[PDB]
């Protein structure tokens, strides 16, 4: 509820 | 309800 | 409810 | 879940 | 789940 | 669960 | 009752 | 009752 | 009643 | 067996 | 068994 | 059994 | 089993 | 069971 | 069981 | 169950 | 199960 | 269970 | 209900 | 509910 | 409920 | 549910 | 559910 | 549930 995901996994490989 | 997903995976391999 | 995820997961391999 | 109730009743006199 | 009720009476006398 | 009442009864006289 | 509500699942492998 | 309501599934593999 | 409910699950391997 | 399950009842009189 | 399991009644008089 | 198990009544006279 | 009703109602005016 | 029932309402107007 | 009514409500106007 | 099981009903108006 | 068995209904008006 | 069994309701009014 | 067993098994040996 | 039983087993040996 | 047993096992040896 | 309901069972061996 | 309700049971071995 | 209610059992062995 008016929430905001940026991200989850940021994998620099 | 009124959300956003900027992402979920980003992979930079 | 109005809360924000800036990451959960950042791996430099 | 994730649920909203504004009002149920609204009644004038 | 991820619902809404704004009203369900609205009643004027 | 992450829900919201904004109010139930709004009686006026 | 035995449900996935309102979630969310991410998974990498 | 043994429902995926309302749900989001990411899977990457 | 035996459900997830609400929940973000993150799995990385 | 006899229930309200997940339902909504409204009764003006 | 003769049970109102997540349901929403609402009676005006 | 016969019991009320997250339910919401809302009763107004 | 083995009963007899003489009368149930006897009723005069 | 070997029982018997004389009357049940004698009523007189 | 073995048991007798002889009445049970005897009402005279 | 929920029955009228070797009874008897007298009703006089 | 919700029956009548082996009853007597007498009803006078 | 919930029933009228081997009873005598006599009602007058 | 109202019943009567007279007998279920008559062995003779 | 108002029986009766006579015998289950009658058993000469 | 107003009933009765007479016997259930009659054994002779 | 898989049950005896008002039934008899008589087994001899 | 999985019961014996209101039933007779006679075993003979 | 997996009860015996109301119930008679007669074993003979």
Given at each position: ?13
């Amino acid at each position: 509820v008016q929430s905001k995901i940026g991200s989850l996994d940021n994998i620099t490989h």
